[PDB]
Amino acid sequence: MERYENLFAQLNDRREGAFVPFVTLGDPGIEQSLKIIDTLIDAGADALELGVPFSDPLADGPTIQNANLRAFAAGVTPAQCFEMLALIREKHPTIPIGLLMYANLVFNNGIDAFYARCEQVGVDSVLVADVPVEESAPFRQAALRHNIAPIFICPPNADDDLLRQVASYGRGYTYLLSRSGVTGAENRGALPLHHLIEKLKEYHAAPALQGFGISSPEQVSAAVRAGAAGAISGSAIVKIIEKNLASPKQMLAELRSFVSAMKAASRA
Amino acid sequence: MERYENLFAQLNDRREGAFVPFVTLGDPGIEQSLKIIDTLIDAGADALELGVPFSDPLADGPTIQNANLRAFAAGVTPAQCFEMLALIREKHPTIPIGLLMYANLVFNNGIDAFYARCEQVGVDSVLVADVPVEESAPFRQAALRHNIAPIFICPPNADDDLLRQVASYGRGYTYLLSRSGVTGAENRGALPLHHLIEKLKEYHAAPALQGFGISSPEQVSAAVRAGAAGAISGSAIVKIIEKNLASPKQMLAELRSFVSAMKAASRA
Amino acid sequence: TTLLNPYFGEFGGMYVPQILMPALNQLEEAFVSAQKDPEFQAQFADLLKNYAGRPTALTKCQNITAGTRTTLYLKREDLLHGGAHKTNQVLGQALLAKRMGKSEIIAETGAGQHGVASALASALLGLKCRIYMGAKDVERQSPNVFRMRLMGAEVIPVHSGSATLKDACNEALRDWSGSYETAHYMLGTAAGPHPYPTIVREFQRMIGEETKAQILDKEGRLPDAVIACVGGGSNAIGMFADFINDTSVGLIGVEPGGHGIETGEHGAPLKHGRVGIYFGMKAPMMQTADGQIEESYSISAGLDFPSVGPQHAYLNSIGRADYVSITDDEALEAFKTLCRHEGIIPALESSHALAHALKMMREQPEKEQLLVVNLSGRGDKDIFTVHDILKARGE
Amino acid sequence: TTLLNPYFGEFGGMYVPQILMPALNQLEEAFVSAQKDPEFQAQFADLLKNYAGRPTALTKCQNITAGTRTTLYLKREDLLHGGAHKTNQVLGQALLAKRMGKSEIIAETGAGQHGVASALASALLGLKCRIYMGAKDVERQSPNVFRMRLMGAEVIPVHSGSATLKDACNEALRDWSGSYETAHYMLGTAAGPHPYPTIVREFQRMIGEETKAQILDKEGRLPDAVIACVGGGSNAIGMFADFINDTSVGLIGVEPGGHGIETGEHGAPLKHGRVGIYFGMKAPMMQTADGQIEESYSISAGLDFPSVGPQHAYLNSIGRADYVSITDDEALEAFKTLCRHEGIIPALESSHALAHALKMMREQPEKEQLLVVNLSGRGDKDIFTVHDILKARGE
Ligand SMILES: O=P(O)(O)OCCNS(=O)(=O)c1ccc(OC(F)(F)F)cc1
Ligand SMILES: O=P(O)(O)OCCNS(=O)(=O)c1ccc(OC(F)(F)F)cc1
Numbered sequence A, B: 001m002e003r004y005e006n007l008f009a010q011l012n013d014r015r016e017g018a019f020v021p022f023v024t025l026g027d028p029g030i031e032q033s034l035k036i037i038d039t040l041i042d043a044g045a046d047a048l049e050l051g052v053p054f055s056d057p058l059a060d061g062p063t064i065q066n067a068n069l070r071a072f073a074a075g076v077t078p079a080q081c082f083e084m085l086a087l088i089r090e091k092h093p094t095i096p097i098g099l100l101m102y103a104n105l106v107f108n109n110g111i112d113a114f115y116a117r118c119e120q121v122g123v124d125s126v127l128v129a130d131v132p133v134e135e136s137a138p139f140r141q142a143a144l145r146h147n148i149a150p151i152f153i154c155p156p157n158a159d160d161d162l163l164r165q166v167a168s169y170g171r172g173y174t175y176l177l178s179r180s181g182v183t184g185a186e187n188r189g190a191l192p193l194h195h196l197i198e199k200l201k202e203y204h205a206a207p208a209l210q211g212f213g214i215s216s217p218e219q220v221s222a223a224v225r226a227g228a229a230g231a232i233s234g235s236a237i238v239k240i241i242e243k244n245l246a247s248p249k250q251m252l253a254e255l256r257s258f259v260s261a262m263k264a265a266s267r268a
Numbered sequence C, D: 001t002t003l004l005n006p007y008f009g010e011f012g013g014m015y016v017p018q019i020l021m022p023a024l025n026q027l028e029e030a031f032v033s034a035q036k037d038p039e040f041q042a043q044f045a046d047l048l049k050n051y052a053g054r055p056t057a058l059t060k061c062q063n064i065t066a067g068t069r070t071t072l073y074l075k076r077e078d079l080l081h082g083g084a085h086k087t088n089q090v091l092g093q094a095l096l097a098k099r100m101g102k103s104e105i106i107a108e109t110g111a112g113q114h115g116v117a118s119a120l121a122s123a124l125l126g127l128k129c130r131i132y133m134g135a136k137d138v139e140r141q142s143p144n145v146f147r148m149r150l151m152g153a154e155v156i157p158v159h160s161g162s163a164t165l166k167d168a169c170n171e172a173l174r175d176w177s178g179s180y181e182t183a184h185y186m187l188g189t190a191a192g193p194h195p196y197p198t199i200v201r202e203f204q205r206m207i208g209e210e211t212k213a214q215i216l217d218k219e220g221r222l223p224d225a226v227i228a229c230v231g232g233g234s235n236a237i238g239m240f241a242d243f244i245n246d247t248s249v250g251l252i253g254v255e256p257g258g259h260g261i262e263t264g265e266h267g268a269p270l271k272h273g274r275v276g277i278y279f280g281m282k283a284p285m286m287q288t289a290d291g292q293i294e295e296s297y298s299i300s301a302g303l304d305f306p307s308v309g310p311q312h313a314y315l316n317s318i319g320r321a322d323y324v325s326i327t328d329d330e331a332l333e334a335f336k337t338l339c340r341h342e343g344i345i346p347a348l349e350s351s352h353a354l355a356h357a358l359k360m361m362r363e364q365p366e367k368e369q370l371l372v373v374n375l376s377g378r379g380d381k382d383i384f385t386v387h388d389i390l391k392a393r394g395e
């Protein structure tokens, strides 16, 4: 399908950036996670980035580490995540859905079979966090064979060779990393690097979404004003879940407020 | 003086051996120690061997180690031991009195001065436990200059050279060691070695007293029947003190009984 | 693009977040440069000789082989400064850190021997050292925690997951992905992303080189086999490397069998796991049906890790090296035997290697064989653990 | 009558109960025989090299002397098997025991390093070992108690007197006076009755011999001074012996100052005691006015002894060696400095020697001097003691 291409064309026509929340699938349980995801969409999410719980998430700080653990405590497995994804797609036919995967979960019982499962449930992109472009060949090949966009990362200090490779190999969107380190709301990323945004455009890369440490509307606005197509926020969203575990109605109200304000900032 | 010479001549005329108890001076206090010593004499001791409390008595087992500690707990010093010795001699003009010394107490503030103090209070012999014949020259010279008998040890495995040296250098009595090891009533010495007794007589040594582990009348009798001039018992005596610390009258009654039985055995 | 091959057959690679690729490339370039640099080699040799005390002895152990046809030597890495083989490669990596202009060190440790090595090298060479250690390991290897702290290292307990080596590894890598501009990650085993398996081997290979020279001097011939325990694989590849081309020489690696392979409470992925991608590498690992990483188990903290270095996976695959397992109880017996009969207190890790050598002897006592066991460390760190066990056991 | 001179000037001799004289004579004859016996010398050399790991390194310590004119080397007896210099002479005495047909060993220990050495040698060479240790020392040097027991030694706590080294010595000698037919008393220091001060020196003198060769190689000249701590005197006489005839070379021995000489809580008889007779020898000792032996004190168990070996008393008397003291707090500072700045954890005993070298440097920082400190052991046994102190201190 062409869900990212269609989204970005629509946003361009409206002179808007994307706001893309991240949550862990099944945190804090399957039913509540599905309601959280429906709330994110209703509140104005343009696309979703969804984590499949993994035992050792090496690119994640404590907030998302804890989300993974809550999902495991609820007995969540990749198979259950694919069941959830099928239900989300059935409700929401056009919203781009991206997965945050760790390599072993993709590699486990065959790379091709993984991407085939993604296509069957209607996923649009996969970002494999611990596979750099240098190791990416079998992943990106399988992705494209199954009509999945493979997502690559442009780090702050990316050299020209890497910019060209990311532009060529990726599809859907380019992940523009705010900063070094691991995920986390407290550690605020730098402003989007204009030079990287400009180079990716020069090389006809998929549109850039800035992520890591984006926790406030001002940061979303700054991403778009720097020329990024949008921004991703994970830890800030997940903190609202963590804070409100015993108050699920309050959880959804706070998620709605936050997502709405972050989306409003994408219009700047 | 000639107190050992006179004693042994008297015992020979009566066809008797000597029984010689050992106690630590000032155990368990000065007054009680003096009464203990008077009891030993009244009960039939032929001579005395008296320890001056020393901090590290390396030839003594736990029983006599503990006697030394009791004396220290009562504040006993060598100076107080010399005061006691003067009182004992004043009461008992003919009984041979021998000291068990450790080298440092003799060497401390001058060897000659030590033996001079012994002569002044009326001591007859000094046995320095950690000075072998090989190191004995200044000790035996000072002893003889002050009319004190230096006591030497004949161990079970003594060779001929040692037997000749002990015969030549010693006076008063020769100490015939029952066994290897340290003092102690529980570890019973062997029978007196006939060959050593016979050799010492051949070499005109001072008469032999057997010591270490002699705790019973049968052992005293065996010493004399083997040809020794007598026997020394320490730990067995000191145990009676230790057992009866809260019962001083009972202490003296038990000491009297024991010493009387041990002396009776010397007549065999 | 790399200067050196990141793979050993199918195994190895550089499976890290894209952010860290420049750091790995920089490290590889610095290593290649240093390996050709006589000043670097002279500095490294000087520290090994005059500071760490190489060469280490090769001890013939007569009493434990009495009545058999086995001759057994022990390579005495237990006598190296710090108490284990870990010190060799830390001195080389610390020199690389300085060469790259880095003033901070991050390390992970399980037995605390890599942590002690990292701390001592940092003290000597003027680096600021922080060490992650699983909270379980902080307890069972406590003497090493005290040693690291006295040398001025920061020791950070890790309570997540199994609270053991894998969890410390995870935290170290997370830290490095944010701190690489100023910090060198001094990985302590022959595992992880390229170039670490290569660098660790090259800075540990003096073990086997010395062993070869010593056994030729003492026996006039190569060993029938060399035997080493396998956590991530550093002491074993260090002993093996110089013998790989000596085809007659058996290479035997000993994984921890824990409470028994059949219990699932072990650390033996090379023989009982399956290939996966974790900790920067494609290698055998203990994993669930769905591909979650399983927690390992061993009585010995230094072997308690659910994967293995990719060169060992490769050597196994081609049949050049054979891998076996030894249980906790077998290791404990070997520990006791060496203490009582040779007067050497071995690390519990090294006791696994010794236990397998003792089995080789006892199973076939009239087989003529000349064996070398890599005695990778001394057991000071383990004495409280072992005491408590034999006590609870009624010994 | 003896084959060798039992005295060093006024000091030394054989002040034991007559019962023990044949045992001392037998030991002296066996030593004289062994010293001329090429097979014995080859066996001893083999154990030192291939089992204990000699020669030990001589490490230059650059960081701690920065900004001064002092060059400081450390002789690394901390790297010997067992963790201290004690292992050298135990291997030689164990061989003498076997030569005399004895199958049991009695030893005393304070720091537990002589006890560990005795235990390991007994395990290797097939002797039954019993070790006396003061109950205070059992507590403050506990890691060594665990090591001795794991190696199959019997460890007997001594509760009498100060419950420290002198009390253990007393019990060992008492035992030997009853068990000498079958047991060898493996005295652990250069003290006691002849022939022990001589034998211990001759079986420790490789320390100074190696040091001389190493410093000539590295500096092309002899040291200005060699510095060693002094308990009974073994590590110091081992370092000194080969330099006694090199008149330019200063010999500096460091006694424990404890809480301060003025408090009377110390172990510095050579400079603050007076000559007496105890433990089989005529030597300086801490004693009361009346001649009772005083209890010593040091933070370091291996120095906590109220006397000193007679050869050190002699070398002092003629002015060939100078003796100084270092307090507990000075030793602790040196311990910390070496851990933090050189990455070496020294024994608290050895820290006294290092502290005096650091004072020599700091007092006169523009004095050109080449110094060697004998780093007699490693501080693993001390880490719990030191931690507890810096903790109670608010560090
Ligand atoms: O808002 P934060 O700080 O929690 O960051 C949210 C990120 N969530 S995500 O799925 O985009 C995401 C994207 C990439 C990641 O690692 C990689 F860069 F190495 F590939 C990890 C998570
Ligand atoms: O009856 P026991 O077993 O207590 O022995 C009593 C001994 N008391 S003593 O004063 O004769 C005595 C005699 C000699 C001693 O040591 C030496 F032989 F080395 F010189 C020690 C004590």
Ligand SMILES: C=C(/N=C/c1c(COP(=O)(O)O)cnc(C)c1O)C(=O)O
Binding pocket: C084, C085, C086, C108, C109, C110, C111, C112, C113, C114, C115, C165, C188, C189, C190, C229, C230, C231, C232, C233, C234, C235, C236, C301, C302, C303, C347, C349, C350, C376, C377, C378
């Ligand atoms: C993991 C650690 N130790 C491992 C170790 C091992 C196992 O690790 P390698 O497989 O990397 O040698 C073997 N022997 C000793 C003495 C060890 O300390 C550590 O000290 O951090």
Ligand SMILES: C=C(/N=C/c1c(COP(=O)(O)O)cnc(C)c1O)C(=O)O
Binding pocket: D084, D085, D086, D108, D109, D110, D111, D112, D113, D114, D115, D165, D188, D189, D190, D229, D230, D231, D232, D233, D234, D235, D236, D301, D302, D303, D347, D349, D350, D376, D377, D378
């Ligand atoms: C008395 C003991 N140790 C003493 C010792 C000493 C002091 O003893 P000498 O003076 O005999 O070297 C010095 N250094 C170390 C490491 C020591 O262990 C003992 O281990 O029994």
Ligand SMILES: [Cl-]
Binding pocket: A246, A247, A248, A249, A250
């Ligand atoms: Cl609610």
Ligand SMILES: [Cl-]
Binding pocket: B246, B247, B248, B249, B250
């Ligand atoms: Cl009464």
Ligand SMILES: [Cs+]
Binding pocket: C065, C066, C067, C068, C069, C070, C071
């Ligand atoms: Cs054999």
Ligand SMILES: [Cs+]
Binding pocket: C230, C231, C232, C255, C256, C267, C268, C269, C303, C304, C305, C306, C307, C308
């Ligand atoms: Cs492992």
Ligand SMILES: [Cs+]
Binding pocket: D065, D066, D067, D068, D069, D070, D071
């Ligand atoms: Cs200097």
Ligand SMILES: [Cs+]
Binding pocket: D230, D231, D232, D255, D256, D267, D268, D269, D303, D304, D305, D306, D307, D308
């Ligand atoms: Cs001393």
